[PDB]
Design a protein around this ligand. Structure first.
Ligand SMILES: [Fe+2]
Ligand SMILES: [Fe+2]
Ligand SMILES: [Fe+2]
Ligand SMILES: [Fe+2]
Ligand SMILES: [Fe+2]
Ligand SMILES: [Fe+2]
Ligand SMILES: [Fe+2]
Ligand SMILES: [Fe+2]
Ligand SMILES: [Fe+2]
Ligand SMILES: [Fe+2]
Ligand SMILES: [Fe+2]
Ligand SMILES: [Fe+2]
Ligand SMILES: [Fe+2]
Ligand SMILES: [Fe+2]
Ligand SMILES: [Fe+2]
Ligand SMILES: [Fe+2]
Ligand SMILES: [Fe+2]
Lengths: 169, 168, 170, 170, 170, 169, 169, 168, 169, 169, 170, 170
């Protein structure tokens, strides 16, 4: 009626966040920024491994590392965009990046080191994003779908790294 | 051969099988209302697109056109689903606004246009959230349409608010 | 805090995508994925048959739909097989017993109305079969659920497509 | 002789494309453009309705034409709306009273022959309307005339397309 | 007003693009289109002949032009044939009597200067021929007029191209 | 050695036609020109049918007709180019085109007429080109391959047209 | 049809200009070269404004400036090509370029200066080309269509510049 | 007009004219056996593609997929020829292997997979050489299909042998 | 003869670094890693500003911000690759990134803040890379050319940001 | 350090021109505008020759003429953009264009005239830009690289024109 | 018989494409392939030399043909080298003795007519060499035969191209 | 000022890109360009040999680099040859004495490590050779110097690529 229009007019500057938004906006924003930090850390680690993984066999892994690195940055972009829509600020500050994150930057010494560290990070991300998807439930479909999409990519990343690690003894 | 006999019965219903657990007639009503809403928002954005002239306004005018054509994609997604679920998609311009959750509003200033669009996006968001809830797990294919459309409307609302915040 | 998340991930690391938080029945999900895989392969072969045999002016319009659907069935086959690998299984492409593993049948058909009906029946079998899998999965495995949800939507489109044709044949 | 051309351009400069030499009846040309815009919007909506409803083997062939035509009608709408702006008017996309502003009607039709005939009628109404407008414009407004000359040619093609279909139905 | 436009469109609906307002001599416009169609087909064959026979360094430059023109002539042929159908005629592609229906001749030529000159003659025959048709049409048939206006401009470009070559051939 | 070069020097203007060209060059040239005329006739017939085959079912045929028309012209170009290589002249004269040809231009009144006339022409070309391929044998691989390629297309055209004709009545 | 052929043979070197060309070839060439000069001047003005229109709002104008500049050069090419067809010489001499044209090169100091000067040139061009289109009448369809097509672009340019100027003050 | 009467007789037979000197029935049998071989080889390679994981094995897995899709191109090429010659292409998975000249073999190691593919390629090479001989000059269009497929199978055999030489 | 080959064969594993490499490789490597840290910091700042610069005018700046961000990452890749070729390790560690860098991550509160911080960072890099180009001289053309190319891009970035800043006040 | 930052803040609006800019900005700007005049003049000459060079043989030269014309315009844009970065104004005024230039607009009567006049202009530019490259030295790498790149293009143009002229007589 | 086909394939499996059914003289076919490979490389170097040296308006036309042909020669070289590997040989790219292994010569030429003739001579040498190789192969090796047949047809085109140029040179 | 620049350009006009201001030793630069051209052609031939012979899973990875490098070498060859023409020389593509003109050798290699090492040696020979030429050129010839600076940078990348491979080979 004229109430639908009045409901939309109230707090109009809140944009995507309407009166019917039933999630905890503050908490979803916290989770998005933690994921953002995790993605940025994983981007830097993978790029490091990409340049360092030289040699015939190792170059195959280096290709995966770079492919993954840029996919992590796409995840960062998806998350940063949602942070803006939900009224937050995406934190790209390198200071304290690792502490905000669920991941660590680990140089590694050998190819086995690099492959394992990426595999651990992918598995940390998988379980962490599964839990967020549960927390969101039906309160925020748009954010849930972002994590659902990122999750499937992280599961592919973990499968990719495990397939390599199995040949590395 | 029991699976085959279920599919063999009422074969002409096509996508709608013995396992379709939603209230098909109601889903069809909701789909047509959404279709009317998308067509109205398409016409509004096209109006604003042509009228938003000037340096700043041309920036909004680009968004207006981008959004207009996205609204029509949603209309197509909804009309296609109406056909699959055994209904008829209503493109009749008569009573279009009354079928709709949105209004066609010309606006006089850019702030008028931007606000009217923002109001429409926020109305659609809450409507599609409710439909998504009503569907539940009874119709994944239709639910996913509204979830995909919903996400776009949330982006449109963010886009329009980002503009409105600087206009005054 | 950081070392508990990390210690959960280090345990059974070779399991890859399957983490400690994976709450589905990995063994059963794998069985369902391979049944769907067999179904997609069977439907791919039927549609390719119908594509080549559906000659004539009107039938060539159906023949196009048949080929489009065939290649979509193979995309579904690849999608399911990739998930089978991620969950630690082996995707079964063996043509022996392919039909018995499947939810659908290869049926040559004699007339175009036969071909359209057999395809329409298969689509409707897949729709209800995959709806049940989506229900079985619940919230335990979003990634697999999303595969079936996407395939389901395509089968509903295929069923509508075949039904739209069948209504004009008699 | 240089500062008179320049002074002619300075007078009423905000009028833009409409120069001192514009010899047409701007107010009337604007009315004709908005009537055409309403007609294109109605024809767009009719064709989209027919596109979705024309299912079956033969009908899918018409449905392709229906969609092709629908989107061409929207291009005509855009061309007309852009010219309305250049000539200092406002393009009216309001769905209220759309049909009364228009030379065409939204007609659902029940059968394919209904849909094809209704489209054919609309195309032929547009052809004679735009012929008259082109005559009314004459040499007073080449730019607007060329828009209608371009749209007319497309509408003649639409009419040929629909008649070709109708000849096999009836 | 609403129902007289519609009654006018409904009458003789099968005539398609040709509405009650079509003021040209449909029978004669069709005769002119088929003559032009024959000319384009003849000119296509001449240019292709010259394309294959014009070998050598210098000649290959002309041969490229011959081929470009050959295919532009065929585009004009299709363009005319499509309008013939819209106006209710039949486009005559019969090679029998093709040359006699035409305004041009197939002339093999022995030298490059022969080939260039014969093409230049045909271009100049078409230019004046299509100028006369454009005048005959006047405002009675904008859509057909624009076809000849567009073809004419291409033919004037063809004549310029051939003349530029002939000037070096002495 | 120095004879290989001396064989190439002799009659150098004959170009592709070397001392080893063992076929009956004048006869091959006649066959190429007869085929060239056949393709031009088939091009004109199909283009006629393309424009005249209007209506719902018939428009499906019209698409095949146009597709075929342009393939016939590719064959024409292929043959005319080979005529040049073998020292002849490609004859595009519309006068007597039909008499030089193995096929006829036939307008047809019904769609069944058009489809049948095309089907008859395709089957004529098939047998003509089969015989030419046999006649050439190994004496002229380059020309043989042109006919082998054209033949394969004509067999497809015949299959296409017969498939249509079977449901027309 | 032996008179048509002899008509074409007479004065064959004149090319596109046939015995039936009813316009004043000499004057049309004069009008085309004036138009060519206008297009070249407007090209130079717009390129100047493009480089000088820096800033947030102004960069929006700068895009239109560059878009228009290259559209002006396309018009210059159309006119030059037609000059050749009608037997003239296209004059690209920068010396006296401004005196030959209907428009001026004006640097402008502010953005409002630049926009106003472009709008003035567009409206001068619009009325000049309207007159040429009338002068040509039915004597030269091909040249008329060139000016008709250019005219329509100038009306778009005038609308584009007016829409900007209305917001500047 | 005698050529025309020759073409009119048995017109519905399409591509198969009076001059068709091959044994149409036998050529059709061979095409369908080849079609079965291509389908089996498609399924084997697809299995190997998904199962060949690891650093080295992924290199083989790429070849496996490339070949898999080339096999399906051959399948289509053969099926279309079956239609032109008036037969029916048999895609039924029942008895597919018995109709085929090749086997589906899962393999346990990468060397097993590579070896099984190499065996299948060498079986096809010799099968298609014999068919090319049988056809002779009786059916150029069919012969050329086998000649094209043959060259691809020879490429496949070289690719697989090149892998196998380094595995042990 | 064999002196060219024996010279190349000595210390072969050093790869791109031949006997003729006359630069101070360890120092060049230090400069390369400092620049890499600068590029990553500038990447993160620009991405922050890109997401935060909302509104009609600011969205124009946001586009420049994103364009620049990705060019900064291209520079990072270019430097990291040269680090590898010259026998070092590229440091992507986010800990202490800002201290290894010549630039700072600064969120900024206003658009003028963001633009000014970016302009300051661009001008720091310009002078820094000019000095490196001088330090390199003719001893290492390949590395010199990398900084020359980056410098030219940074000079464009400084002009871009300065052009925005004049309209901001 | 914070002096590095303060150095960037001093005269911040000067953008690409930093405190370390050691060239004579005023003179580099004068040289850039002269070259801009040269490129515009050479653009106009080549366009004239392009339209006027008709005939079989001449059409080959006409193609080179147009290719070069558009390459000259690219140089023009490249120089004009650098003029902006260094704080000047690019002068596109057609008035006095030729006097500001190092080249002349020359219509030429024969094809040999056109080729010769173009060849002369190319060789004037080659020596002119070599001197500018020397004057710049190490003071302005970014500008030096622009002239170095343009120079290479002009040397290619000279070789192209000489190759034509050698066969013309 | 399913295990004899398999046993034939298993015997000498490392020979790859070379099966028990390979009826040609593998050693001799490899010799001929390497001779052709040398011929193609020499012809590549000749054409590249001619491409750079053929300056002037008329000559620039020839230079384009020279470059196109040069790169087509390199495709032939690759095509032959790939077949050499498949048949179990080693492709010899050694510049030492390249000319002695080849059927053609590297000839700089002084005039354009020199360059064209030398290329024309080389094309005609290859034509007769490859016709003989095609005959020698007969039905023993279809895959290799088809390589020479495809290369041959290109060489026949190259010869026509050079002769067409030479005829106008004097 | 105007007519002196013009007179300087007019003197020795046929020398083209080489103006009075060319301060390098043109004869010597031409010698160095031709030596480099020989090196690039030899390196092209070596890498092509290695590309075809490096079979196997790991080696196929090297084979890709080998082919990528081979074709980059040919780009360098063309870049150098074009500059030879501009400076008034003739690029020598003669395979006779090619190796003696070159700074590198064609080496077949027996193992993959052999192939990788020979390429690595060649890259390092080229790297120091082109650094010296860049120094010899100084500021006398920017256009040629930039060619060598660009080629050098590619060779440093090639050397790094080959070294990266060699470390894992043993
Ligand atoms: Fe991620
Ligand atoms: Fe990941
Ligand atoms: Fe929407
Ligand atoms: Fe929306
Ligand atoms: Fe499926
Ligand atoms: Fe319309
Ligand atoms: Fe219409
Ligand atoms: Fe024409
Ligand atoms: Fe044909
Ligand atoms: Fe055919
Ligand atoms: Fe303009
Ligand atoms: Fe196969
Ligand atoms: Fe195979
Ligand atoms: Fe920067
Ligand atoms: Fe230049
Ligand atoms: Fe050749
Ligand atoms: Fe190189």
């Amino acid at each position: 009626v004229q109430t639908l229009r009045d409901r939309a007019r109230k707090n109009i500057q809140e944009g995507a966040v309407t009166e019917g938004y039933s999630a905890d906006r503050q908490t979803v924003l916290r989770l998005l920024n933690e994921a953002l930090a995790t993605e940025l850390v994983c981007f830097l680690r993978y790029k490091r491994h990409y340049f360092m993984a030289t040699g015939l066999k190792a170059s195959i892994a280096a290709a995966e590392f770079l492919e993954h690195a840029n996919q992590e940055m796409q995840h960062a972009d998806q998350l940063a965009e949602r942070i803006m829509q939900l009224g937050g600020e995406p934190d790209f500050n390198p200071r304290g990046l690792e502490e905000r994150s669920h991941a660590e930057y680990v140089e590694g010494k050998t190819l086995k080191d690099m492959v394992t560290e990426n595999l651990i990070a992918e598995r940390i991300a998988i379980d962490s994003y599964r839990e967020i998807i549960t927390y969101l439930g039906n309160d925020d479909p748009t954010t849930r779908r972002i994590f659902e999409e990122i999750l499937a990519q992280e599961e592919e990343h973990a499968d990719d790294m495990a397939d390599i690690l199995d040949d590395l003894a």
